[PDB]
Design a protein around this ligand. Structure first.
Ligand code: CVM
Ligand code: CVM
Ligand code: CVM
Ligand code: CVM
Ligand code: CVM
Ligand code: CVM
Ligand code: CVM
Ligand code: CVM
Ligand code: CVM
Ligand code: CVM
Ligand code: CVM
Ligand code: CVM
Ligand code: DCW
Ligand code: DCW
Ligand code: DCW
Ligand code: DCW
Ligand code: DCW
Ligand code: DCW
Ligand code: DCW
Ligand code: DCW
Ligand code: DCW
Ligand code: DCW
Ligand code: DCW
Ligand code: DCW
Ligand code: DCW
Ligand code: DCW
Ligand code: DCW
Lengths: 82, 82, 82, 82, 82, 82, 82, 82, 82, 82, 82, 82, 82, 82, 82
């Protein structure tokens, strides 16, 4: 067991990296997906192209939150200090 | 049984990870699902394609919050410090 | 029976988990449901398709706040520390 | 009878759980219901279908705040610590 | 006459439960009632339908704040601690 | 005369219950009333129906702020602690 | 003649009750009155009906702020504690 | 002549009462006045009806900030405590 | 000459009264005036009627900030305490 | 050279009066001038009218910030306390 | 050299007067200028009138920030206290 | 194992770099991808062009957050101080 | 070589003056330049007039931030106190 | 190796520089790129011209965040103080 | 080598200067660039005029953040105090 300023800061930090880090990407994925299904309603023949482009986009955005995830995980499972 | 700065920080961190972590994805899911059912009303024949793309989208967004859940669960059931 | 920093933090944390965890999902659910009933007004024949997709959607959003609920419940009934 | 940091925290937490927990669902219920009554005016024949889907939606949103309520209730009537 | 941390926290908690707990429902009620009244102007013949769906909706929203009011009332007239 | 943490917290609490508690309902009543008079301009023959529905709505919203009022008044005229 | 925590809190509480208490209702009154004069321009024959409904609305909104006034006046002229 | 916590709080309170008390009403007055002059451009013949209703409105909004002014004035010229 | 907590508070209060007190009225005056000059362009024959109604409006909004000014002036030139 | 709580509060107060006091009027002036210039483009013949009403409006708004400037200048060159 | 509460407050105050004081006027100048060039695109023959009116407007808005500037400069080059 | 002010500041810093650093890019990516997918629906033939411009854009935005990630990674695996 | 409250305040003040001071003018410049290039697309013949007016506007806005720069530079290179 | 107030500050500063520094540019890059791909769909023949102008824009915005990056880098690799 | 309040403040200040200094300009650049590429889609023949005006614009906005950069650089490489 260990408790000090740095272990305390690490668990808070871990929460903030993934917590805050999902805000922009979460909204952004919704905006993109929303336009995707709207576009499919408009032009069902473009479904494949639309899906392909969305998927790509979803990946970029999800990688943003994943950066927060790796920081969180480094802090919890590979902490350099504590 | 155990109380210090780091246990106190862990329980707060746990709540913040899942609480904050649900904000962007919750809004994003509503936006996407909203455009999806609008699109279905507009072009009921496209419902399978729209549902497929939405479902894909919903999963990517839910995953953002699940990262938060994971951090919360590690802090609660596999805490590295306390 | 027991009071320290960690019991105090735990009860605050439990409330922030569910309380904050309902903001994005509640707003999202409203956005999606509203587009659903609007969609039904526009095309009452698509009512079954619209309803099925809405329901799917509402479940994904409900799960986001449930993650908060779960963290709140372990904190209250299976606290790892106090 | 008893006052310490946890009883004080428990009462504030209970309030935060239900108070904050009503913000998203309250806005969302209004957005849905306004769209529902707009739909009815637009297509009074779909009223039953609209009302049915709205009811389903409202219950989902109400459940979100109910999660807050139960945390508040546990804190006040089944408090694990104090 | 007793004053301690918990009695002070309790009166504050009481105000926060009902004060904050009215923001979402109050806004939501406005939105819904506004759409309803506009709907009546558009289609006076659907007034009974519109008015019924509104009433149902208002009640769901008022319940959200009432949960706050229950917490306030427990904290004031059935306080578990003080 | 009496001054302690709890009398101080009570007068602040009283102010916050009615102060904050008027924000949502005040905006909401404006939104609803605004659509009402707009609807009357559009369809002056629906004036009675519109007024009836508004009035009902205004009552629900005003009851939300009134909950804050009763808490304030319990705190000032029927305080359980001080 | 008299200064302590509770007198200081009372004077602040008084200002906050009326100051905050005017925000939602002030905005709401502007919104409603604005739609009212727009409606009059649109249908000058409906001016009596529009004025009647507005006046009713203005009263309900003013009452929200008056609750704030009342709390302020009790704190200043009928203080229960100091 | 006299300085303590309560004189200090009283002057701050007086300023917050009028200062904050002008935000909602000032914005509201602008919204209503702007719709009024727009209305007059659309239907100059309704100018008298529009003006009368505006004036009524402006008075209700002005009264909201006046409540703030009144609390400020008693605090300055009829302080109950200091 | 004199410095204590109340002189310090008085100067800050005076600034807050006029500074905060200009925000709503400043925005509102702009909203009204922009609508006024838009109306004039639309119907230059109504200019006198528009200008007249605008003037009335502007004075009402200016009075709101003037209430702040007078509190500031009392605090600086007729201070009851210091 | 004197430094005390009040001299420090005074220089800060001075900045807040004119700094905060420019937000509403600055935004408002922009809104009004933008509408004016757009109006001129729409109806170049009404330029004299539009320009006169604008000038009048600008002066009312600049006065709001000037009140802030008066407070600043008193606090700096005619300080009542220090 | 001199360092005390008041020199420290003066340099911060100076920054806040011009820093905050550019926010409203900066936005407002953009809004106005934007409508000006839009109006010129619409009616290039009105270019002279539009420019004349913009210029006037820009001056009023720029004077608002200049008030913050003179306070800053009084504080740095003509400080009444330090 | 070392804990000091700097190790604590470093883990927090790491979370802030990637957490905050994802807000703008995440929102921006959503906006861009949404427009792209809508564009494809409008003109399926331009899909290759649209998709290429999007990909280029996504990369510029992901780099913004990656800068945050670099700072986080230095702070964690190549800390200059601790 | 020199450290005290006022040197620390000066360096912070310097950053805040230019940092905050760029917010309104940066947004305003984007708004104006945006309408300018839209206007050019709309009426390419007006490009000289639009460019002239924009350039004038850009200068006035840049000047707002430069006031911030000036305060920062005085604090850094001509500090009156330290 | 070394921990003091400046090393702690340096690491937080580095994070704030790149984290905050990505917010505006990230939003702006998204706004530009979305408009770019919308333009391409509208006029696929202009793609090269659109892509060229977008590239120029993206580099300008990226440079803004790069300024943050370099401050962060100096703080971490060329720190003048620690 | 050296740590005190002023080195600490200086590094924080340097980061706030560039970090905050990029928000308005980054958003502004996005607004202008987006209107530019939209303009090019509408009128590809005006591409050169549009690009030239955009470029001019981007430079004015870039300079705003550069002022921040400059304050950051003197603070780091030509600190007047430490
Ligand atoms: O000054 C050095 C000493 O500091 C420690 O105690 C200090 C230390 O600042 C910290 O535990 C405590 O402050 C803790 C408040 C910070 C809470 C949280 C931390 C990270 C996430 C954000 C905020 O205060 C103690 C007393 O002032 C420990 O007593 C000891 O290990 C160490 O040597
Ligand atoms: O490192 C854990 C230590 O916790 C205590 O000291 C702690 C103490 O908990 C706390 O009141 C104090 O800071 C109290 C502030 C708590 C702020 C909050 C708590 C978690 C959520 C975010 C931050 O710091 C002390 C450092 O000396 C006790 O001395 C002991 O239980 C244990 O040694
Ligand atoms: O730090 C854990 C310790 O908790 C207790 O001490 C605590 C004490 O309860 C508390 O007043 C003190 O901090 C008091 C402020 C706590 C505010 C907190 C913030 C997060 C949300 C809940 C409210 O810190 C002490 C640290 O020694 C007990 O002394 C002991 O059982 C235990 O070791
Ligand atoms: O006055 C008698 C009572 O005093 C104690 O409470 C103390 C407590 O220890 C202390 O931290 C507290 O100072 C803490 C001030 C906390 C302010 C808080 C902020 C929002 C929620 C409510 C108000 O003062 C209390 C005064 O009542 C005990 O709680 C109690 O055992 C005892 O009966
Ligand atoms: O610790 C218990 C004792 O606490 C009291 O003094 C304490 C007590 O926290 C409070 O008066 C004071 O803090 C008062 C700050 C809270 C202001 C306000 C209160 C409600 C509304 C929101 C915030 O500090 C005293 C000294 O730290 C009293 O001295 C005594 O009656 C009591 O026994
Ligand atoms: O309970 C009232 C008591 O007030 C004083 O103690 C008070 C004192 O006023 C105050 O500086 C301290 O807290 C000071 C913080 C004031 C915060 C603010 C004030 C009202 C507006 C909201 C909250 O707490 C002390 C508790 O010991 C004096 O000891 C005495 O006048 C009186 O016994
Ligand atoms: O609590 C009331 C008492 O007020 C004075 O003491 C005061 C003292 O002025 C003040 O520095 C201290 O608090 C100092 C901080 C006050 C900040 C306040 C917050 C609200 C807005 C105005 C500024 O508390 C003391 C409490 O003992 C006098 O000692 C006495 O006349 C009186 O009994
Ligand atoms: O330096 C000499 C002077 O010192 C005293 O002021 C003291 C005061 O008591 C103390 O609370 C104060 O610390 C309080 C710090 C308050 C910061 C405040 C926040 C915003 C508004 C302005 C700045 O330090 C002052 C230093 O001047 C007295 O006010 C005065 O009688 C005396 O002439
Ligand atoms: O109480 C009076 C004495 O106050 C001074 O020290 C006090 C004084 O409040 C101030 O320097 C320091 O607080 C400084 C914090 C305020 C930072 C900043 C100031 C203006 C801009 C906004 C906030 O604390 C010292 C110790 O508490 C000096 O020691 C002395 O010159 C003076 O006589
Ligand atoms: O525990 C051992 C170390 O303790 C010291 O750090 C002390 C430091 O002096 C003290 O101000 C500090 O209390 C300050 C609490 C600051 C909270 C801060 C807020 C956001 C960024 C991170 C967390 O406690 C530290 C505990 O590590 C020294 O930094 C270091 O020399 C030493 O090795
Ligand atoms: O007046 C300058 C004095 O600075 C120190 O005292 C200062 C000390 O710097 C500081 O920690 C304390 O306040 C520390 C708070 C710093 C807040 C922040 C700093 C600048 C940016 C805005 C405000 O006040 C002390 C007053 O006694 C030292 O005693 C000495 O270097 C010098 O006499
Ligand atoms: O005030 C300047 C003095 O700085 C040092 O003392 C400093 C000390 O570093 C610091 O912990 C203390 O304040 C500690 C809190 C500083 C927070 C600060 C806020 C702005 C952004 C950066 C972080 O104040 C002391 C004042 O005596 C040294 O003692 C000395 O070299 C120098 O005279
Ligand atoms: O790094 C990138 N972001 C992620 C997008 C989804 C796949 C994983 C990488 N892409 C580019 C950003 C610019 C530099 C790296 C390449
Ligand atoms: O990792 C990703 N996010 C999850 C979304 C839900 C399905 C599981 C993966 N997507 C991509 C982003 C990073 C690059 C490749 C993976
Ligand atoms: O359980 C859920 N929420 C309840 C709200 C009240 C109506 C019934 C559902 N939703 C989903 C979360 C778990 C996955 C499926 C269910
Ligand atoms: O886990 C998910 N969310 C729940 C929503 C309600 C249905 C049950 C699953 N979906 C996917 C997100 C990540 C990929 C796998 C699971
Ligand atoms: O319980 C609910 N909320 C109240 C609204 C007003 C009428 C009474 C019920 N809704 C549902 C929550 C989930 C399923 C049960 C009912
Ligand atoms: O409680 C309600 N709110 C108020 C509306 C206006 C009249 C007074 C009651 N209504 C319903 C909410 C759900 C449960 C109670 C009934
Ligand atoms: O109490 C109400 N509010 C006031 C509005 C202005 C006229 C006086 C009453 N209305 C209703 C809400 C609570 C249920 C019945 C009363
Ligand atoms: O007195 C009011 N405000 C004044 C502003 C300057 C022009 C004259 C009116 N309005 C109302 C508040 C009290 C009720 C009627 C008057
Ligand atoms: O009190 C009210 N507000 C004032 C506005 C200006 C005219 C005078 C009254 N109106 C009503 C609100 C509550 C019901 C009775 C009074
Ligand atoms: O005094 C007012 N404001 C100033 C605006 C610029 C011209 C000078 C007057 N307006 C009115 C406040 C209420 C009635 C008096 C005048
Ligand atoms: O003071 C004013 N503001 C500035 C506008 C640009 C030229 C310099 C003055 N104008 C009027 C405001 C009302 C009182 C003074 C005249
Ligand atoms: O001083 C002004 N602002 C600057 C804008 C950029 C060119 C230089 C002047 N304009 C006017 C406002 C104050 C009254 C006259 C001057
Ligand atoms: O360096 C830049 N940003 C990265 C975006 C992703 C591709 C790699 C470069 N842009 C420009 C900044 C200013 C000029 C240099 C390039
Ligand atoms: O230098 C500037 N920013 C650079 C961003 C990357 C592309 C090249 C320009 N803009 C202006 C600021 C100084 C005035 C002209 C240049
Ligand atoms: O200083 C200015 N801003 C820079 C933007 C990029 C081109 C170089 C100048 N423009 C004017 C603002 C104040 C009037 C003179 C200078």
């Amino acid at each position: 067991m260990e408790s000090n300023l740095t272990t305390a800061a690490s668990v808070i930090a871990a929460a903030l990296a993934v917590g805050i880090g999902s805000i922009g990407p979460g909204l952004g994925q919704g905006q993109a997906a929303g336009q995707a299904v709207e576009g499919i309603a408009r032009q069902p023949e473009a479904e494949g192209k639309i899906r392909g482009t969305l998927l790509l986009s979803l990946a970029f955005m999800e990688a943003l939150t994943i950066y927060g995830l790796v920081v969180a995980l480094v802090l919890l499972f590979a902490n350099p200090f504590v």
